[PDB]
Design a protein around this ligand. Sequence first.
Ligand SMILES: [Cl-]
Ligand SMILES: [Cl-]
Ligand SMILES: [Cl-]
Ligand SMILES: [Cl-]
Ligand SMILES: [Cl-]
Ligand SMILES: [Cl-]
Ligand SMILES: [Cl-]
Ligand SMILES: [Cl-]
Ligand SMILES: [Mg+2]
Ligand SMILES: [Mg+2]
Ligand SMILES: [Mg+2]
Ligand SMILES: [Mg+2]
Ligand SMILES: [Mg+2]
Ligand SMILES: [Mg+2]
Ligand SMILES: [Mg+2]
Ligand SMILES: [Mg+2]
Ligand SMILES: [Mg+2]
Ligand SMILES: [Mg+2]
Ligand SMILES: [Mg+2]
Ligand code: NA
Ligand code: NA
Ligand code: NA
Ligand code: NA
Ligand code: NA
Ligand code: NA
Ligand code: NA
Ligand code: NA
Ligand code: NA
Ligand code: NA
Ligand code: NA
Ligand code: NA
Ligand code: NA
Ligand code: NA
Lengths: 147, 142, 49, 142
Amino acid sequence: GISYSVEADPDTTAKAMLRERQMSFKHSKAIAREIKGKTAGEAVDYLEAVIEGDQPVPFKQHNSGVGHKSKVDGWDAGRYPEKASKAFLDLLENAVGNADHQGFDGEAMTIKHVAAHKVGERKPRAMGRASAWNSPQVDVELILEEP
Amino acid sequence: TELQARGLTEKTPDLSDEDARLLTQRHRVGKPQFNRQDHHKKKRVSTSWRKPRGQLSKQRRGIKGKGDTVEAGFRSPTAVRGKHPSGFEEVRVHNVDDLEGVDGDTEAVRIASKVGARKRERIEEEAEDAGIRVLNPTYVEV
Amino acid sequence: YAGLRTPAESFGSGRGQAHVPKLDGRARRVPQAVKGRSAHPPKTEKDRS
Amino acid sequence: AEFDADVIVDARDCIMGRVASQVAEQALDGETVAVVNAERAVITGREEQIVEKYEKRVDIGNDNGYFYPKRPDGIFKRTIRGMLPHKKQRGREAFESVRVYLGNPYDEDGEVLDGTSLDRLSNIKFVTLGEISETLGANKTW
RNA sequence: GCGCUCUAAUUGGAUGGAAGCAGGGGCGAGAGCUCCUGUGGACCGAUUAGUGACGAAAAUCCUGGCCAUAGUAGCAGCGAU
RNA sequence: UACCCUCAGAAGGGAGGCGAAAUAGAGCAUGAAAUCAGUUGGCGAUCGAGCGACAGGGCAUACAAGGUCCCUUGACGAAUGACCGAGACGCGAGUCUCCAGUAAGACUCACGGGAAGCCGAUGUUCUGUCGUACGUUUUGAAAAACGAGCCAGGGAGUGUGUC
Ligand SMILES: [Cl-]
Ligand SMILES: [Cl-]
Ligand SMILES: [Cl-]
Ligand SMILES: [Cl-]
Ligand SMILES: [Cl-]
Ligand SMILES: [Cl-]
Ligand SMILES: [Cl-]
Ligand SMILES: [Cl-]
Ligand SMILES: [Mg+2]
Ligand SMILES: [Mg+2]
Ligand SMILES: [Mg+2]
Ligand SMILES: [Mg+2]
Ligand SMILES: [Mg+2]
Ligand SMILES: [Mg+2]
Ligand SMILES: [Mg+2]
Ligand SMILES: [Mg+2]
Ligand SMILES: [Mg+2]
Ligand SMILES: [Mg+2]
Ligand SMILES: [Mg+2]
Ligand code: NA
Ligand code: NA
Ligand code: NA
Ligand code: NA
Ligand code: NA
Ligand code: NA
Ligand code: NA
Ligand code: NA
Ligand code: NA
Ligand code: NA
Ligand code: NA
Ligand code: NA
Ligand code: NA
Ligand code: NA
């Protein structure tokens, strides 16, 4: 798995990671790209609205065949990745959880860094069968920073 | 307070006017990269030089613009060939013993990288006392 | 017989594959194949005196 | 409007080609040039044929395109573009700093370059850009 | 003439940090040689004389890994909607 | 890898503990390339395609392992080599003699003055010149002849006998 690619300062920053999540890696790149710079709280409201379908996530790189969404600004194509989104909410719930347990204002913290990384190969178990297709396996780092 | 290299890092050799003109020539003219043909087109192909053998090779045929082919007319002047840019002739040094016979005006010294900090210190100083310069000196705080 | 212990055979032309002897889908015997014989190896019959 | 023309050339009764050749030369030296009275510029030869050459250039084309000007405004400018490397940076710059105008939109009269004037007294076989354009089907606005 | 493996003789380096790797400096027309910083954490050379399963961009080459293809095709068609 | 927080949770994550080292944390020594995410430098939504070589500009650069470089003047100065002016020809473009092998002339150096992203070098990009891969087949290959998606590793004159 990954390790934090960026360097933070414990006194003014929180951390959070997701490991081997089986979900579209392409959707993650988008979401990350999309929620970076936002506030932990703004991100949550955003992601939930996406899971809803009221807000579309701009697909700028992996957009072949994707139909245009009117709510996308400066761009045209986008979708509502609810699986990948539900997983980012977990990363956030965790990042904001660690936040407060350190006397921080999680919801108001800034997403200084968030990035997805394809990790591949789940790895069979003892008493367990094998991986069917090649579902992508994602890792994702998140660094919350005081405003 | 600041870092300062040990030794005579400013020392310069003394070269006969001719050798100085010649050294100056080499530095002026220089030479072509002489990299392998098309190395920049295919990653698997390394930059290292191999004579172009293709019967139709544009380089092998000397098409202008396809790179200079390695040939003797490209050699450096006898006098300065191998000389460090400073003008010094180098001597590969592994231990204090190796410092014997080295002329501090004619040659500078390069301590094999494999030599450790302990054995370096010995060499570095003894070398200076012999009037020899060390091209790769230890940088200490003074 | 290192590398030669196999009945591997090349399918020949027709499937867009180099004519390389294969068995169970893996290439074998020939020198350029991983696990294939060694073209010009060391020899016992050589006089090293 | 408003073109800080460094030079203003009057095309009236002047050989289009020859003018265009000099305007190109100067523009390639910065010389911001403006050409005046292109409607009155002239090209020698037998009218009937001249027209054909131009009429053909209008028919020529397809999906990709071949935009050929019918106004004397354009005719002249394209003629000039033809004498410059308008695809290269410096070429597009020179061309860009050259404009043809119908009549004269300036105050100062235009100047006539050397060897570009046709002597109407000793020349009966020639044509006016305007006449060509009127033929090409252009809308006379001059 | 350059480079690789291992043997020998002669002679050196390394936990005060070897080999390898990444980035960078110098030399050689060049094969290549060498140095600096980081990594690494235990081995590594030089000269001479030898040894050889000794040098790859190619063979619809072999084996493994990976990218684009693509968040695309398929997950509808069947008298059992 | 105890304890604590989070989580539906023996998951995972945060905090933390061990050790010289956890980027030695379980298919765990080192950890290349292809390649992926994030990001820094250069380019960039009016413009042209063997992707470069050699020249020369922009912009960018911690130290180290390179230390040069710019301008004034002056010295030296191969081949080449004048302007102006004086006289003399040519219908004319222009030429001849003289001034003169003079002034000039690449490289190199000396004095004085200057540069520290500053010189080299490196990354990217701009301009000029040249330029339709590579290998093979072929009289002729950029070929609408044949081979390869990319990278790493593997991959082809060897032994005996005799001459
Ligand atoms: Cl993917
Ligand atoms: Cl030689
Ligand atoms: Cl058209
Ligand atoms: Cl052009
Ligand atoms: Cl006439
Ligand atoms: Cl040689
Ligand atoms: Cl010289
Ligand atoms: Cl041979
Ligand atoms: Mg579609
Ligand atoms: Mg390459
Ligand atoms: Mg084998
Ligand atoms: Mg010896
Ligand atoms: Mg070959
Ligand atoms: Mg393959
Ligand atoms: Mg498609
Ligand atoms: Mg029914
Ligand atoms: Mg490891
Ligand atoms: Mg034929
Ligand atoms: Mg190999
Ligand atoms: Na895209
Ligand atoms: Na919009
Ligand atoms: Na829009
Ligand atoms: Na067998
Ligand atoms: Na194949
Ligand atoms: Na034997
Ligand atoms: Na004409
Ligand atoms: Na037309
Ligand atoms: Na540059
Ligand atoms: Na062939
Ligand atoms: Na070819
Ligand atoms: Na062809
Ligand atoms: Na494939
Ligand atoms: Na071999």
